[PDB]
Design an enzyme around this catalytic site. Structure first.
Site, PDB file in Angstrom:
ATOM      1  CG  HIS A 142       3.404   0.288   0.188  1.00  0.00           C
ATOM      2  ND1 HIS A 142       4.674   0.574  -0.111  1.00  0.00           N
ATOM      3  CD2 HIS A 142       3.051   0.866   1.408  1.00  0.00           C
ATOM      4  CE1 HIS A 142       4.534   1.826   0.738  1.00  0.00           C
ATOM      5  NE2 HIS A 142       3.763   1.831   1.528  1.00  0.00           N
ATOM      6  CG  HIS A 171       2.555  -2.812   5.048  1.00  0.00           C
ATOM      7  ND1 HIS A 171       3.105  -2.012   6.016  1.00  0.00           N
ATOM      8  CD2 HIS A 171       1.595  -1.547   4.717  1.00  0.00           C
ATOM      9  CE1 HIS A 171       2.872  -0.803   6.046  1.00  0.00           C
ATOM     10  NE2 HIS A 171       1.977  -0.628   5.064  1.00  0.00           N
ATOM     11  CG  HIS A 227      -3.276   0.878   5.663  1.00  0.00           C
ATOM     12  ND1 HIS A 227      -2.659  -0.619   6.019  1.00  0.00           N
ATOM     13  CD2 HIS A 227      -1.874   1.490   5.547  1.00  0.00           C
ATOM     14  CE1 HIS A 227      -1.484  -0.652   5.910  1.00  0.00           C
ATOM     15  NE2 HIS A 227      -0.943   0.718   5.632  1.00  0.00           N
ATOM     16  CG  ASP A 228      -0.732   0.954   2.111  1.00  0.00           C
ATOM     17  OD1 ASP A 228      -0.957   1.940   1.892  1.00  0.00           O
ATOM     18  OD2 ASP A 228       0.312   0.461   2.953  1.00  0.00           O
ATOM     19  CG  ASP A 273       1.191   3.250   7.307  1.00  0.00           C
ATOM     20  OD1 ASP A 273       1.484   2.123   6.720  1.00  0.00           O
ATOM     21  OD2 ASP A 273       1.187   4.221   6.570  1.00  0.00           O
ATOM     22  CD  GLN A 280      15.844   4.296   7.371  1.00  0.00           C
ATOM     23  OE1 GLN A 280      15.062   3.690   8.156  1.00  0.00           O
ATOM     24  NE2 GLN A 280      15.251   4.735   6.347  1.00  0.00           N
TER      25      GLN A 280
END
Ligand SMILES: c1nc(N2CCCC2)c2cc[nH]c2n1
Ligand SMILES: [Mg+2]
Ligand SMILES: [Zn+2]
Length: 313
Positions: free
Chosen positions: A68, A72, A106-107, A217, A269
């Protein structure tokens, strides 16, 4: 006014593709972002001096966490850039402005821990924002940076256009809360199937921008296998650190976050691709047909993870 950013030939071509990797040269990422704003929005959307100061303040407020991070942020903005470029006429001038900035921001100031860990820690942010804790913080940080002297990249908008773009950015950033994605996708599924989906309905647009935000994202799962596989290491580096911190609070973490249970990763996953990623890009491809390469790339990676489980790698 006449100062265009140009990328080397390979990047100039590859940057238009959904599966583009921004590369390991941190010093090229701001120029890649500005390049994308200029082609996506116009060379006039932002005062270059202001935009550059905003980008560098955003970079400074991303932390040195495994996933993050600043990389990213630019990766998610590039995916949004690819969606906007392949869906030219569907989005307003304000929306193209807002969404690339929303993605870059956004992060902001992410510490590498989930909303769940903050609430179990009893972090101050969990007192201030009961739901979408980190996402309300990211939006807060965005407004803070916009309000630095010389950083208001929206200064040339009318009061009303300014309020519209900050409202687009707020909803876009809140939508990156994966807890909210499940309901949002279901409603978009119902609306698309019953035929009621209406892109002139603001509430419907909001939902569709939300799904684009989830899609951008999660775009790690839409890269070529070598990128997807190496990014999953960074993702799980954070999950295992959070699992370690859960154990320190005397809480056994979910197996996903337990570094003792690395064996269970490949099956975890599959679950994620089947429960989140595939449904996300499926609904996105139904609403915005030209985003199909994201679904195709995602399916290819699911197949690669199935090969990992079948010990074929
Ligand atoms: C497993 N889980 C994931 N999510 C859980 C929370 C958000 C990301 C991801 C994301 C990318 N690759 C992943 N693998
Ligand atoms: Mg986030
Ligand atoms: Zn993110």
């Amino acid at each position: 006014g006449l100062m265009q950013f140009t990328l080397p030939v390979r990047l100039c071509k590859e940057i238009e593709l959904f599966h583009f990797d921004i590369g390991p040269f941190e010093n090229m990422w701001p120029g890649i972002f500005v390049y994308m704003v200029h082609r996506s929005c116009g060379t006039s959307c932002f005062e270059l001096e202001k935009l550059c100061r905003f980008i560098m303040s955003v970079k400074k407020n991303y932390r040195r966490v495994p996933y993050h991070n600043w990389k990213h942020a630019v990766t998610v903005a590039h995916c949004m850039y690819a969606i906007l470029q392949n869906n030219h006429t569907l989005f307003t001038d304000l929306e193209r402005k807002g969404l690339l900035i929303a993605c870059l921001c956004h992060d902001l100031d992410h510490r590498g821990f989930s909303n769940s860990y903050l609430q179990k820690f009893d972090h101050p942010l969990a007192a201030l924002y009961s739901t979408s804790t980190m996402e309300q913080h990211h939006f807060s940080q965005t407004v803070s940076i916009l309000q630095l002297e010389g950083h208001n990249i929206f200064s040339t908008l009318s009061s009303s256009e300014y309020e519209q773009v900050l409202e687009i950015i707020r909803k876009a950033i809140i939508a990156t809360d994966l807890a909210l994605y499940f309901g949002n996708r279901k409603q978009l599924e119902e609306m698309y199937q019953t035929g009621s989906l209406n892109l002139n309905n603001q509430s419907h647009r909001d939902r569709v921008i939300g799904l684009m935000m989830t899609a951008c994202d999660l775009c790690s799962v839409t890269k070529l296998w070598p990128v997807t596989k190496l990014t999953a290491n960074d993702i799980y580096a954070e999950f295992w650190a959070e699992g370690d911190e859960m154990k320190k609070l005397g809480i056994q973490p979910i197996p996903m976050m337990d570094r003792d249970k690395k064996d269970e990763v490949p099956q975890g996953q599959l679950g994620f691709y089947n429960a989140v990623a595939i449904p996300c890009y499926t609904t996105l491809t139904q609403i915005l047909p030209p985003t199909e390469p994201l679904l195709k790339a995602c399916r290819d990676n699911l197949s690669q993870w199935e090969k990992v489980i079948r010990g074929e790698e």
